[PDB]
């Protein structure tokens, strides 16, 4: 519950990064840093936790369950919650300080039957489209 990580866009091969002017920009892999790409899950919509734990040998916990559990992701270094914005269905998310409560994020993984889906997306579209673009 709370671990810094990066985000990988499988179909484009670029990193989801927080740009300086309070918005998210999908940015390449060659240049990156943890400060722009450091996100962690939270138990709830509050600052009740700041820093705890560290590095542990094994899995052990079976903490988060897909589907049933509810999670709130949040950037750690900025300390800012992801908020949906109702601009002018295309809700372009902007980094608002407090944030609305109607921003719950459920979790549904690519299952074992969809492990083939994960394999096909990553391998096929990433490698094939990059090689084809290079040849073109």
């Amino acid at each position: 519950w709370g671990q810094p990580f990066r985000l990988r866009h499988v179909t484009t091969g670029k990193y989801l990064s927080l740009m300086e002017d309070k918005n998210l920009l999908l940015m390449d892999k060659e240049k990156a840093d943890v400060k722009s790409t450091a996100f962690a899950f939270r138990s709830s919509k509050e600052k009740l936790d700041v820093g705890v734990r560290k590095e542990v040998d094994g899995m052990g916990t079976s903490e988060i369950k897909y589907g049933d559990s509810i999670c709130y992701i949040q950037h750690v270094d900025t300390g800012l919650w992801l908020t949906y914005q109702a601009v002018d269905i295309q809700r372009k998310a902007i980094m608002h300080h407090e944030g609305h409560m109607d921003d719950g994020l459920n979790l549904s993984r690519s299952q074992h039957e969809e492990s083939r889906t994960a394999r096909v997306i990553r391998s096929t579209v990433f490698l094939f489209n990059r090689f084809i673009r290079g040849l073109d």
Partner: protein, 433 residues
């Protein structure tokens, strides 16, 4: 058209079993000698038919078609395993030399049916029907209850083994879709149906009440779910809840509770339309009987889900809307039978409702089976009773007046004042006594 309506009924009451008892016997000869170096050795045409149906079900279509052949042969197969009359009829037959023969004959017929993959076909068809009700699924469910009738552990094990080895999720998703798409009484449509052509239905376009679109379908579906777990089969009682092998788990117990709440709301809303009225309509009593039977079947399924002590099922029920459902059911039960008491013509509906009362209290008793002393289950039971205290008080306080919804104390009047007769005492004498 008159001869159509005449011959549709005057010969089907005799031809159906005569055809169905013989067609399966001739389609299962299993006698001709192959005299060839082969292992399987030409089992029967019936297995070929089962494999054809299974292949059609397994073929990916995104929409299951009509397939009149399947409905015809599924009706034939379901009626093949229905040699029992399932009625007392005349006086009671011999005790332990005829019931055993009937059970063994039924078991032999179910062996003939399920030795070829009938359970496989039923599960595949239910999974293929992507949560859509209709005659596509009605015949499949009827055949399922036909092959499962009697608590057949062999076919139960076959279904469980196939589901576990296939890791099927479409079957459970389709079951959830069907139980979501089940119907209710629709009092709003009942109003329009009642108010037609001035009064009642004078034009008489047909015999479609449309008050309950699918009644036999719902009853057969829940009978299928009940027979799936009859015999205190903990394997099925757990697999209907967790589905450990699969990834996208679907809970059937919670959905059954949701359907019970949905039908309870209809039961409650069908009360106030007749509470003000002094008499109950001929269509209203039939609708009440149908809804009562549906509620009885749902309650029986809930009893079978927990009759063998299954702590997971008990906790899942304890954390559901079953408490609101039972509170509303207690209110309706409490206010219905006393209105029904005065009328002498409507005693059959009163008895049918008291059967539902018995099944409800049986379910509430089976809720407390592995009851630890200081249990959240008992705490939630008394937390249910505290707000239903009004209904509970007015049934229990009015439970003991020598008659009138309960007692055998009324005999104390007839015995005192009668010289020799069977008892023909006047109402004034009864009141004075």
């Amino acid at each position: 058209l008159f001869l159509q309506g005449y011959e549709k009924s005057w010969i089907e009451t005799e031809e159906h079993y005569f055809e169905d008892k013989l067609i399966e016997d001739l389609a299962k000869p299993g006698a001709e000698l192959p005299e060839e170096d082969e292992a399987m050795k030409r089992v029967d045409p019936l297995h070929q038919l089962i494999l054809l149906f299974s292949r059609t079900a397994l073929t990916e279509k995104c929409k299951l078609e009509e397939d009149f052949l399947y409905m015809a042969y599924a009706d034939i197969m379901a009626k093949s395993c229905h040699d029992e009359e399932d009625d007392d009829g005349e006086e009671e037959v011999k005790s332990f030399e005829e019931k055993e023969m009937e059970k063994q004959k039924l078991l032999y017929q179910q062996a003939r049916l399920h030795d070829r993959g009938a359970a496989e076909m039923v599960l595949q068809t239910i999974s293929a029907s992507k949560g859509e009700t209709g005659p596509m699924v009605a015949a499949t469910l009827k055949l399922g209850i036909a092959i499962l009738n009697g608590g057949n552990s062999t076919v139960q094990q076959k279904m469980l083994d196939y589901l576990k080895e296939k890791k099927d999720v479409g079957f459970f998703q389709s079951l959830a879709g069907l139980m979501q798409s089940c119907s209710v009484l629709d009092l709003n449509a009942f109003e329009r149906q009642n108010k037609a052509e001035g009064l009642g239905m004078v034009t008489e376009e047909g015999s479609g009440e449309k008050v309950l679109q699918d009644d036999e379908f719902t009853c057969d579906l829940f009978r299928f779910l009940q027979l799936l777990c009859e015999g205190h089969n903990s394997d099925f009682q757990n697999y209907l809840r967790t589905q450990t092998g699969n990834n996208t788990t679907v809970n059937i117990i919670i959905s059954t509770v949701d359907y019970l709440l949905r039908v309870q709301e209809s039961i409650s809303d069908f009360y106030w339309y007749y509470s003000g009225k002094d008499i109950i309509d001929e269509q209203g009593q039939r609708n009440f009987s149908k809804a009562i039977q549906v509620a009885k079947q749902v309650f029986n399924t809930l009893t079978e889900y927990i009759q063998g002590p299954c702590t997971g099922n008990q906790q899942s029920l304890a954390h559901s809307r079953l408490w609101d459902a039972v509170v509303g059911f207690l209110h309706v039960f409490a206010h219905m039978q006393m209105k029904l008491s005065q009328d002498s013509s409507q005693i059959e509906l009163l008895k049918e409702l008291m059967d539902l009362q018995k099944d409800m209290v049986v379910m509430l008793l089976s809720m407390l089976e592995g009851n630890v002393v200081n249990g959240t289950i008992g705490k939630q039971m008394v937390d249910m009773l505290v707000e239903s205290s009004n209904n509970v008080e007015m049934i229990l306080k009015f439970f003991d007046m020598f008659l009138k919804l309960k007692d055998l104390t009324s005999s104390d009047t007839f015995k005192e004042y009668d010289p020799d007769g069977k008892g023909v005492i006047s109402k004034r004498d009864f009141h004075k006594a």
